[PDB]
Each structure stands twice: as structure tokens, then as C-alpha cells.
Design a protein around this ligand. Structure first.
Ligand SMILES: [Cl-]
Ligand SMILES: [Cl-]
Ligand SMILES: [Cl-]
Ligand SMILES: [Cl-]
Ligand SMILES: [Co+2]
Ligand SMILES: [Co+2]
Ligand SMILES: [Co+2]
Ligand SMILES: [Co+2]
Ligand SMILES: [Co+2]
Ligand SMILES: [Co+2]
Ligand SMILES: [Co+2]
Ligand SMILES: [Co+2]
Ligand SMILES: [Co+2]
Ligand SMILES: [Co+2]
Ligand SMILES: [Co+2]
Ligand SMILES: [Co+2]
Lengths: 461, 460, 460, 461
């Protein structure tokens, strides 16, 4: 069964129980590109609903929207915000129209769910109207970007939790491996001694910078253009409505929002999206570097560095034991490369704004929510399926530190530069340790245990 | 209800109904990252099955695999090639493992479907073994990349068909607007006359270069490393098996494949993916510019260029008639920006190869298969729902042409550059036409109506 | 005429009148790639010299360096700081060795200039040694990334001065065009009325956001790893030395520096370069939109939007008087594209770090200093040679606002949606203003002149 | 001492000295952005003068350019083609104008040099006009992109020569290390045996691919729009003029050039540049991974892979012997990252085309010519200064192979899977070779020497 609806282009038959309407139906036909629909990015659906609740409350309080229609609309928004009706948001994320299809998907679905609450039938738009009532005082160009900013704010906690979790895992391994002496490597050449613990604490340290800079950057989104309507001149939406709507949207979302400084600027500026993507791009670059180290430090088992052992999560051959593919970090690098790619997409999109509008905010929101979700899962998997279970190869780390030619420097104040250089040269020609060569020159072994102690070199005063 | 399987890491309970095994089950746990499973890229599944059919056949012909197992493996691969069992390919496209997870997902499903065709229950690997039988004479590092290449080859037609569709839309609007004179624009300044038809056929002409460049580049994927195994040294696979498996994979896929020249180089080289991601990027860059020209030319209705009118696919406000948001092109632009980024993701991945292998082909194949699909759909919509129904504002077009001070350009071959420049400046300074200004200086009214016809200036 | 120098690889002949040494000579031969030498980023040379002055002073105060040597080194450093000896930094910016070549170019030059401020010959390194004395307590790995941070910090001003300059240009125009009413455009479709002044003050507005983010990001460079030596374990340099050197470098540079929190992390973290490069990327993205807006609003003279007119800085085609190519925004566009490519370069280099070091700080620092210098010049040019002389086309702007259909919304509470939608459709259908159609239906002329005033609509 | 010139914006004073005139002088002031002038990309300056000469010659042959002025213009183009007058090309490569400023620099300089050949004074434009004569039958939008295509064709040789050189260095090391057995590595895990020579021969094979792809992509540039003028309509250039100019440009340059199929399309289409940039990018991507492989194989000396030794080109300290920074690969990598960014710069300029013209070819040509030049020099330096001198650390290579657990598979036909697997497991636990475990199970040493030969595993029949 179907019902019959009408827009400024004509009539169509919508399936009887669909909560979306004619406008959404056309957009499903117009933008069939990715098979990724609005409900694949639920945070934006929840956000549109909160913005639509805020406006309805504001209109009601200013006596522009009748009580029964406010009650019905609010109850409908509440349903969507608590995650009902998600399957009704069917529009492709790659939609044209600068956000209009998302706005209309929300307008129609809220309208019809509102009607259900009033005991009227779907499609009875004379009672609750998708444009006249649910979109009162509003514009795609202020509702959509406001919800976009809201959705990024709402999905902030998933990436913060993930960072904290990865931080906590590196800290623990930094503590566990505190006295595990090894050789540091610069340009991939053996340099001077360091512990495995300082090295893991430094992975921890780098990500502590990230959670701070991300928080700082997210705060730019608290600035909203709600009330500027179409191009920032705020025509058709009163000052009092804008004031009230923002106060309401703060209450609903639990986030203190404010009006942006210049709404004509805010109508078109995507600069904040570039900045936010940049910090996701930074996390991915840094994160990728960590994943690379864990791949390098565990290379082997016999003909690599073999200094750490990652947990074997992948099945192997009984006749090929010891082969441990660094499979979680690999999965992490792929997330990072993708995050970097998506970041360029945001850049091209941001760059292509014209006059009073950027038309490509839907592509932007899709890439940022994607990068955020992917990065959260990569970091969570890295922490629990890999980092938590890493083991030090204690003897083989020590071997590297003990084999360092750099230890010969500690002999200068005892035998003179010329002769310490000789030992250095000899140790390298013959392949023995500085310790072994030093012994042959009649220097005492228990004295050398002190002089050439690598843990002493790694830990400054 | 579950069944009990064993791998190198130990024992695990697998759902009764599942054709995948303990190795796939583990990879599903290890790489839960995106929610996009292998089944979202079915051409690679289809391709993986094709390779498994070919390998099985070549092992049977060299008497390495006995007949009853051969007949059962092949039957199972056929079922996969025919679109059955797709829901069993459950591994995340962002998998670590350089392909092993996709490879093992095929091994386990093939073995359990092969077991079923042969009477026996899921997990009786003593009979059909995922590793020892289905993966016989193979390594992830040769079967997976070959599947990757075959999956790209088989996806050519969706993009070629869409390019051919868009070309035909433009060609037709080219003929429809052959005499619709308008003004050209360089650097957004008014230039010399041209027809809308010429503009449109130009769009079709650039997408013709693209269909050819695409064939040429897709052709590199015909070269496969099947039988190089782990690192290119051919260990565990005979020369005889390699040639035979290629002959067989050629017959099965409908495409003439050949052995690549250096299996050692081939084991790790990802330049073929960069090249092909590159033409997709070209198509994106070209297609996005066309979309942009469509948005500019349809700007208005009254304070834009207003030279064309796209079909109104999006309903507008009853109080704001004449607003047509160039919504299909916008959607295309956005597809184009996603393809460009995807091309960088392939770049990052491709550059990060180490020694005998590149560990990130899962990412590469996923990004290229996506961009191919999005370009196909974007071009097919652009053609069917925008171009086919575009209409010219004939009088606004004409008006930009006759108005133009550029009409003096056509007097350079008459009175030399200098005197013609002089005529141009006098018209602009005195508010007279170039026609008006030129009779002034003694030239025949008769010859000028012809010489300064803007439609004449558009053609040789 | 040459002199004879030795390093661990052997003996070489160095030009007699060179302040550089055998290690710089070797570097010149090793990385001849680009024809762009260290002196082409002088801010890094000055910075290297400041840090060397900081190290010598701290070394002096802690009694690791004797007073005669301290004072010669310090005086050499001052010469470089003052702009002398720039022709002696000859090493390619594309150098390998992760800083070493730049550090040794500094060390040798400073040693040799110290030798004359002390009356000794060039090359007499038993008296002033480039490694033992000028690099004392130091490694490339902490000296070089500290110089980079300082260089970037000392170049902040130029991009700040240029931003403020362009802000002021736009603000000034913002006042001038306050009442110049025109139609807004969304998706290139006629929207609602706005003033050219508002549009221009929004340009200013966005750039003021950029000045604050740039400042805020620059501050991250204030944290230095100086003292951390080779890998961040402080080997060969004491706590007191590091504390003292950071105090002394803060005095020398004029910027309050502080020791970074974790020196092991600092040894390899290139993240701050990514964040910063991101703000340049952002500026470029915003800047290119603005440029694009200026090229669009000036399109014409006859058949574009014709809303503004940019000063003519190139001479025109005389066969087309009144054609003005937007030559200055194009040049800015090209700069913005470069900065964005440049940003990807940094992104690769940052990602490529291995274990205790990232080897690619020289490529990172070169690209950033380029980008900064480029944006600084671009924005100055856009302010002085374009924005300041922009003229508004008052009548063409006004006609766009009056001919708009958005006007018909003002009539909804006068005559009702229904009848006001009809006025909109008849206006479009007949080619008349909302005003002319509204006058037909009998509505009062003097109420309509206020009602459908576009200037009124522009301001809440 | 100066001279006085005039354009449609007033008068200015130009150095008596100079061959450029008033228009070039304004361009110097208007576009001061980089300090990189036209003389930094001489290939373009030369190509412009080739096109200029072709057009003069064509005009002369159709009786539109007087013989004396033809002779003088041609002698001037000849001087520029032969490398004279380079310092008169002073405009910034970052020019606005879509190439007009480069075209006018060519026009003016040629005019003044032609005048000198007639013994006339500088700026006597009544005799030789930069627009009227030197620019006859031409527009910027056909001459400049033609000059650009030909600048890239003139330049192709340096990158092709560099590629062949690098190829040659790899092939020779391929031969020299033909029997240096080592362990192959997949995901940084020990895999199966392979020879170092095979590894180096793979480098050669992959760069051979690049020469073929570069050649075939460069051939797209042979298609030129000379004679399409402003927008592809050909106004002001006769069919005959165009036919003759192309025949003539082909003769001057030594390259079979042909008119492009659709001059309207060709007026704006930047697709050929993207494709050329892309194969440079692809060279960067592969070159970079070779550089990385080199830095990794040479890692150590003692706590890395240490399979090869790169020539020490950078000096070290006498107390720290054995430390060899992989300094030339590092500079290759850096170049590769630059080219990859330059490819993004091109992609931006290309996407930015509008209607009948793309305005950003000056930036495009500059980036591609830079990229080509860097790639050439990096590849040349890698060959002469690193590869040609690489050494194998032969015993360490052989130890990697013997330490490999993959050897146990050879034992299957001999002792059954179960026992073969048991040996592999025991070798892994004790850090012993498969050979050592095998001996201790009472298998014969001279038998096992044959069975477990790594060199047989590296080389198929
Ligand atoms: Cl979401
Ligand atoms: Cl697919
Ligand atoms: Cl500088
Ligand atoms: Cl050049
Ligand atoms: Co779905
Ligand atoms: Co915290
Ligand atoms: Co799914
Ligand atoms: Co065809
Ligand atoms: Co290849
Ligand atoms: Co220089
Ligand atoms: Co300020
Ligand atoms: Co802003
Ligand atoms: Co940091
Ligand atoms: Co110069
Ligand atoms: Co050849
Ligand atoms: Co073309």
C-alpha cells in the first residue's frame, strides 16, 4: 500500500508506513551514489533532531508555534534523539544540495512522527507541516551547519576515550620495561643506550599532547550560526528567536554554545573543518609512526631487531613457528593512511566554497565522522589486542646495548682519547664488545662493569 | 549451537551454520574497525574464487590434487562465482595481514562448501583442508594480489559504460545546440564568440581521451605473479603449475592474462595501483571541472550568467520560483573530491612497501574499487538526470554575443591589428557599436554584417 | 690557492678564502639536487648562530670552555646574527643527514671566523675546533631542531604583518561599501539582499580568526629539546648546561623559551610541524576562496556578474578595451595551491620518522619557510595592488537586488503567502520586478518602496 | 641612463640596458612573490622562442610578415634558443595572467633583439612591434600552452638519462651479488631464502617499467593547439598559417608534433599534465621505497639487519667507528616527498579550470619542471655516489639464511611432517639452526648440507 503526496514538482506515491515523505523520496532517486545513507552517520541524525527540538521550543516560547504542535514535534525529536526511527534516514551521504536533503529528511520524519503522537495519519501535513511548522524560522544554511558542528561535538568522546586508553597502555609498558636497557637508533644506525621503558613512555607522552590539542580544536565548534538563516543577514528569523534557540540547544545537548561573531562570515567559512581535520591528520601521522616502530622493533624473529614480542593474534604454520606478523599495527597504518586521504577530501571541499555558501558540507561531515570513528577503533584495538600483551626480549635488548661502540667514550678519562679510539676501532674490526677489547688491554673487569654501564648512560642525574 | 575447530593458537567455538572457520573468526575479532566487510567489495570475492578454481585445476592437471577433492573445490568456487555464499565473507576491508585474512576467508568457505557438495560436515578438514588442499601451491602473496588485479579488470566495464553514457549525453546536446551562439570566457573575462554546441561537444571530447587512457592503464593488470608464492622465488610451486594456472585463470575470467616478467620485483611493486588510481584522479579532476562549468552556466535565474537551465530535480519553495539549485553537479563534485583523497590514500600505502612485500594492498584495493563505483554512479546520474534534460536560454546566450566589444577582433585580418584596435577603443569610449564605428572609417556596411556576425566568428 | 683539511674520511683541498671546511665541502658534493642553498632560508642560518651563541655561553659559565675561545665564538656568532657571512652557507636544503650538514656548515664557519676574531689562520682547528668546541655539549639532534623552531618563531612576524595588512584593506573597503546593496548568492543561485560592505567585512572577519590561530599554534614551537642531545637521554650534556642554554637563548632571540616535557619523545616528534603547516594550509584554503570570490565578482565587463572592478595593473588587449584580467587574485590562487602541495610534503616527511629520530627536518623546515614567505608576499600584494583600489559598480549591484524574487517574501504578511507567491511567478514569467507586478495588483507605491527595499532587508 | 616607453596605462622609465620593455617591467612589480624568475626554468624560455620562430616563419611564408622583419625576428629567436639573453627573462614563475606575462616577456625581448639586428634603437616599436609583429596570428592561449608542452618534451631526456643510469647501477650489483644468499622478509618477518643480487635486479626491473611508462605519457604532449588562438575557435589564425606553423615547429624542435583533435576542448583541458605529474609521482613512490629498503638493509652496524654497506660519504668521529648514516637515500626520500606534494599542487591547479581556459598553467609548468629536475639529480646521485659503491656483508647475509626456520620444510620428505615440525620448534626455542637440531637427531651433516641448501631454495628451475 502507498499514500499520495505532492510537492512543487508534482505527485508521487510514498510507501504507506514510511515516515519520510515526497522530498526524501526524490532525494533517494537523485543521489544514489555510495549506498551509504544518513543512518550510517547517526550522530548527525541525533544532532538534526536536537536542533529541531531547540527551534520548536524557541518558537513555542515566543508564541509563534501552537502548544499541541510543539508537544507533538518535541516528543518526535525526543524519539529520534533516543535513537528511534534511524532506518527512516535514507538519503545518500554524498547528496547534493548543501544539506537540504538532510534537513528535509528530518523535517518530514519529525512531522510524520509528530502526527502519530497526535493520532492523525501520515501525510496529513495541513496539521503538522514539514516546512511551515518543523522548519519554522529556519534555513538549511543555519540548521544544517549548526547540526554538523553539534554532531562533531557529540562524537568527540569516542576519540578521547580511545586516546586515553592507548595512553594508559603505553604508560603501563613504560613502567614494566623501565630497566630494560637497549640501543637507541638514529637514522637506523646504532647510537647511544636508552631503556625500552623510556621509549614506551615517550609514545604515551606524544599522545597526551594530542588529547589536549584535539579538545582545544573541538571548542571552535561551539560557535554556531543558528539564526543567520540563508546568508547571515538573519532575515525571517528574529533576534529573540536566535537568542532563545541557542539557550535551548545548550540545554538539550549539554554543551555551552554561543553565537558566532559575524554570521555573514559564518555562512560560508569552512576553515574550522580544515583545522579539525588537521588534528585528525596529525593524530594519524604520529600514530602511524608508532605503529611503524612496533613493526620494526618486533621484526624477526631471528634476523630482525627482535627486541619486543607482540601478541600472536593470527594463526600460523606448525612447521613455521616464530613467524609473528605485526597484524594489528598494520591495520592501524591503514587507518592512518585513510585518515590522511580523507583529510585531503576535506581540503578540496573547503576550498571550493563560493560567495555566500560552501555547498559541500555533507561531504565534509561524512569524512570527519568517518576519520573519527576509524581512529577510535584503531587506537582501541591497538591498546587491547597488542600493547597490553607486548613482551620484552630482555637478553636481546641488553646484547644490543652491550655491543654499542659508543660505550668506548666512557674510557676517555681513564686511558686517553687516542687509546679509547683504538679500542673502539678494534672492537668493530673484530666484532667483540668494547668490554671484551678493554679486558685484553689489561683493564680490570669489575672496574669496567662500572665504567661501561649502559643503564648509567640512559638515565641522566 | 557451535562446532569446535583448532588452529595453531588453539581451540575456538564457531557457529554451526558458518562456512568460515577459526581463522576467519579470529580475523573478524582482530580487525573490527570500519563495519565494511569483504562482502562490500564482491568483485574481489568473485576474483578470489576464480583464482582458487584456477589453482585447483592446475594442481589437478599436475596430479598434486586428487580428483574427488578437485571436483568438490571447483563446484564450491563456482557457487561463489555465481553470487552464492557472499554473506560468509565477513572480514573488515581494513584488515591487517597483507591479504591473508581475505585469502583464509576464501580457503575456509571454499573447503566447507566443497565438503558439503561431497557429503561431509563443516570442519572435516582432514578431507578438504583449507590450507593443505584449497591453498595448495599458493601463498597469500601471490593469490591475493592476483585476485586484486583480476578484481580491477572485471570492474572496468561499470566505469567504461558510464563514461560512454555521459559522452553520448554531451554529444547529443552538442548537436542540439550547434547554432546557439554565446560569448566565450577566458579567466572569467568576456572573450570571442563560440556556440554552446561547441562547448558541449568539447566536454564529450575530453571524456573520449579518458575512455582510451583508461583501457591502456587497466591493461597493466593483465600481468600477474601467480606462482611467485611468498617472495617471488617460486618456492612450493613448480613452473608447470604456474603456466597452467594462468591458462586456466584466463579461460575462467574471460581475459587474456600473462605471467609478469620478474616475480621478485612483482612481489612488492605497487606502481600499477598508483598509475590506475592516477587516471581515476584525472577523470575526477576533469569531471569536477565540467560539473563546475555546469553550475556557473546555470547560475541565475536573473543575476548569474543564465546561459543554460538544468532540470529541476529538487523541489523548491513556491514563493521562490526560478531557483534551480545545481544539485546533481554538486553531488558529482563531491564524488570527485572523494576520489582525489582516495588517490592520496593509495599513494601513502603504495610508498610504504618494505623489502619483499607491500603490506597494504587491502587498503589499496578497497579504495580503488570504491572510487571506480562512485565515478560510475556519478557519471550515470549526471547523464540521465542532468545532461539529457539541459535546455538553452537562446536569447540570453545570443545577447552576450552581439553586445560584445570583441566583435572588433574579426577586423584584424581586414585592416590590420592596429586600426582594428583603434576601432574597438572608439566604440567603447563613444557608446557606438563596432559596426557603427567601422562604417565611420570607410568600410562597407555590406561586408561587415557578414564579417562581424558572431556565429560566423565561431567557425572557420 | 687552497688549504689542506682532514676528517675521518681523509684529506681534501678547501678554497683559501672559504670559512667553511672539509665537512661542508663534502656535503656540497653529496646533495647537489636543487640549486637552493642554506642561505636561501637565512632565518635558519641566524637561528643556528643564536643557538651556537647560547651553547658557547652556557659552556663558558659552567667552565667547560675557556674565556678566549668563548669570546671568539660569541663574536663569530654575532657576525652571523648581524647578517655577515651568509654567502658561506652553501649546503643544499634537500640535504640528507637530518641536519648534520647544516650544523657543520655553522660549526666550521663559526670556528673559522672565531679564528680570525682571534688572529689565527683559517683551518687552525687545534685552537678552535668545530666539533670539540663549537659543537660542545651538543648533537645535531637537539641543536638543529631547536634552530628550526627558532627560525619558524622568528619568521612569524612577516605573515602576521601581511595578514593584518590585508585585514585593514578589507575593513576599509567594508566601510566604503556599507550601503552598496546587491544580491547574495547561494550555490551560485540568486538569494537574498546583502551589502558589498558586509561581504567585504566578512573577508576581514575570517582573516582575524587566522591571526589568532597562527599565534596560538606558533607558541608550540617555544618548547625546545636543547640539552637532550643524540636521542633525548642528555648524554654528554649536564642539566645545568641545558637550563642555562635555554635561559641564554631566550635572551638572545627575544622569545621566552622553555624546556619540553619529555626529551625522548621530543627527539622524534614532528607533530608540531604538522599542526603548524595545517594553519598555513587553512589560511591558503580561506585565501583561495576569497581570491576566487574576487575573480567571480569582477567577471565581465558585459557578461559576467560585473559587481566590482579591480584596478588594472597589466595593460589590456587594446582590441578589447575594458577587459581586465584578475591578474592579482590569480597569482594569490597559485600561491595557495603551492602551499597546499607543500603541506602534503610535510605530512609525508613527518610520517617517515623511525624510532629515535625523524631524518627529514631539513625538508620540513624548507617547505614551511617557503610557504610562509609566499603567503606573506601574496597577501601584501592582494592588499596593495588589488583590494585597496577596488571600485564598486553601484548601479549593477543595485539592479541585482531590485530584480530579485526574494523581494516577494516581504509581501507574505501584507497579502498572504498564496497571493504573494502569485506575484513572484508572474514577475519571473513576464520579466518584471516584484515592484512592477505589485504595482499592477493595486498595492500602494509608497508602502511598496519601503516594503521591498533590499537595503532594509540586509540589516536586522 | 634610461629610456621612455608607453602602454595603455601611462609611461615608465626602462634601463637603456634592457631588452624587455614596459609590460615585462610592470609584471616584475605586480608579481614579486618567490624570487624564482622565468630564467630558473630555461626550457620554457627556449620553447617560447621556438614557437615564436615557427609563427614568424609561417607568417613570412604567407606574405604577411615583411622579409627584413622576418629575418630579424628569427635571428633573435635563434639567439634565445642558443642560450643567449636568459637574464632578460625576469618575470616570476608565480605570475597571474594565465601565461600572458611570459608571452609578453618573449615578445618584448625578441622585438628589441630583432631591432638591434637591424641596427635600430631599443624600443623602436614602430619598426618591430611586440604585439603587432612578434605576436602576429597568435594568442597567449595557444602559444603559451604550446610552449609549455614543448618545454616538457625538451626536458624529458634528463629524467630518462638519469633513470637509465640508476638502472645500470642496480643491474651491475645484481650480477655481483648473484650468489650472496640471504633471508627474504615479508611484513618484516623472516620468510624464505633469496639472493641479494635478485633483490637488486628487482630494483632495476621496476625502474625499467618507469622508462616505458614515462616515454608513452610524454607522447601525449606532442598534441598541440597552436592556431586555436583565444578559445579554440581559430579566429585570426588561418588554416594555412596553423598547418605551416606546426610543420615549422616540428622542424625547429626535432619532434613530430601534430594538431590536437578538438581545439575548443584543448583550450581548457589540463588532463595531460595531471597524467604526466602522476607518472612522476609514481616514480617518486617507487624510488622512495627503494631508498627506504637501502636504509634498512644497511642498518646497524651491529644491531640492525646489516646485510649491505653503503659508501661512507659523510664524515664521522674517530671514537665512533662503524656508524654510517645512509645520507644519499635520505636525500632521495626527501626529493620523493617533494615531488608527491608537487603532484598535489598540480592537481589543485588542474581542477581549478573555468570555461574556455585554465588560468593556472604557469604554476603547473613550474612544478613539473622542478619535479623533473629533482628526480633526475636524485637518481643520478643515488647511482654514482651510493649504489655503484655498495658492498655486501656476505657472512651476515649467509647467517640470515642459515638461521631461517623455513629450512625445516626441506626435511619433510626425509623424516615426516611431525618430526620436521618438532625440529623447527626446537631450533626456535634454543636459538640453534635447523641444521644443528637435525644433526643432534642423528642426521648426517654432508647429507643435510645438500638437503637444506638455501641457494637451491632461492633459485627455481
Ligand atoms: Cl556517527
Ligand atoms: Cl566491487
Ligand atoms: Cl628564511
Ligand atoms: Cl628548465
Ligand atoms: Co546501510
Ligand atoms: Co586527560
Ligand atoms: Co555490511
Ligand atoms: Co569507445
Ligand atoms: Co611492476
Ligand atoms: Co643561491
Ligand atoms: Co592583531
Ligand atoms: Co570562521
Ligand atoms: Co610532541
Ligand atoms: Co634568480
Ligand atoms: Co631504454
Ligand atoms: Co585533452
Amino acid at each position: 500500500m502507498t499514500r499520495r503526496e505532492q510537492d512543487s514538482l508534482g505527485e508521487r506515491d510514498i510507501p504507506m508506513d514510511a515516515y519520510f515523505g515526497i522530498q526524501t523520496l526524490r532525494a533517494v532517486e537523485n543521489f544514489s551514489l555510495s549506498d551509504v545513507a544518513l543512518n550510517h552517520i547517526p550522530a548527525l541524525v541525533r544532532a538534526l533532531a536536537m536542533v529541531k527540538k531547540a527551534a520548536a521550543t524557541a518558537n513555542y516560547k515566543l508564541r509563534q508555534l501552537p502548544e499541541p504542535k510543539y508537544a507533538a514535534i518535541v516528543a518526535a525529536c525526543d524519539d529520534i534523539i533516543d535513537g528511534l526511527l534511524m532506518e527512516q534516514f535514507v538519503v545518500d551521504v554524498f547528496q547534493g544540495g548543501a544539506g537540504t536533503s538532510s534537513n528535509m529528511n528530518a523535517n518530514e520524519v519529525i512531522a510524520n512522527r509528530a502526527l502519530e503522537h497526535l493520532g492523525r495519519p501520515r501525510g496529513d501535513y495541513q496539521t503538522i507541516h514539514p516546512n511551515d511548522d518543523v522548519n519554522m524560522s529556519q534555513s538549511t544554511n543555519d540548521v544544517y551547519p549548526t547540526a554538523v558542528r553539534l554532531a562533531l561535538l557529540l562524537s568527540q568522546n569516542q576519540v578521547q576515550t580511545a586516546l586515553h586508553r592507548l595512553i594508559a597502555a603505553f604508560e603501563a609498558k613504560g613502567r614494566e620495561f623501565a630497566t630494560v636497557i637497549k640501543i637507541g637508533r638514529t637514522q637506523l644506525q646504532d647510537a647511544v643506550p636508552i631503556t625500552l621503558g623510556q621509549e614506551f613512555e615517550a609514545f604515551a607522552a606524544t599522545l597526551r599532547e594530542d588529547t589536549a590539542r584535539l579538545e582545544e580544536v573541538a571548542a571552535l565548534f561551539r560557535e554556531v550560526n543558528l539564526g543567520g538563516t540563508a546568508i547571515g543577514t538573519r532575515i525571517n528569523a528574529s533576534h529573540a528567536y536566535a537568542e532563545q534557540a541557542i539557550v535551548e540547544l545548550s540545554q538539550i545537548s549539554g554543551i555551552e554554545l554561543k553565537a558566532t561573531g559575524n554570521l555573514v562570515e559564518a555562512s560560508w567559512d569552512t576553515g574550522a573543518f580544515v583545522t579539525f581535520s588537521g588534528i585528525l591528520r596529525r593524530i594519524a601521522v604520529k600514530l602511524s609512526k608508532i605503529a611503524n616502530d612496533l613493526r620494526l622493533l618486533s621484526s624477526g624473529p631471528r634476523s630482525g631487531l627482535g627486541e619486543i614480542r607482540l601478541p600472536a593474534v593470527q594463526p600460523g604454520s606448525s612447521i613455521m613457528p616464530g613467524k609473528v606478523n605485526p597484524v594489528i599495527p598494520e591495520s592501524v597504518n591503514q587507518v592512518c593512511y585513510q585518515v590522511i586521504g580523507n583529510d585531503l577530501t576535506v581540503t578540496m571541499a573547503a576550498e571550493s566554497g563560493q560567495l555566500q555558501l560552501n555547498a559541500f558540507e555533507p561531504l565534509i561531515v561524512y569524512n570527519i565522522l568517518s576519520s573519527m570513528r576509524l581512529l577510535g577503533r584503531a587506537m582501541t584495538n591497538l591498546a587491547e589486542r597488542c600493547v597490553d600483551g607486548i613482551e620484552a626480549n630482555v637478553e636481546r635488548c641488553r646484547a644490543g646495548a652491550e655491543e654499542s661502540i659508543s660505550l668506548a667514550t666512557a674510557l676517555v678519562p681513564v686511558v686517553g682519547y687516542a687509546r679509547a679510539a683504538e679500542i673502539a676501532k678494534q672492537a668493530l674490526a673484530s666484532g667483540q664488545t668494547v668490554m671484551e677489547v678493554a679486558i685484553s688491554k689489561g683493564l680490570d673487569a669489575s672496574a669496567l662493569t662500572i665504567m661501561l654501564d649502559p643503564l648509567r648512560m640512559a638515565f641522566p642525574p
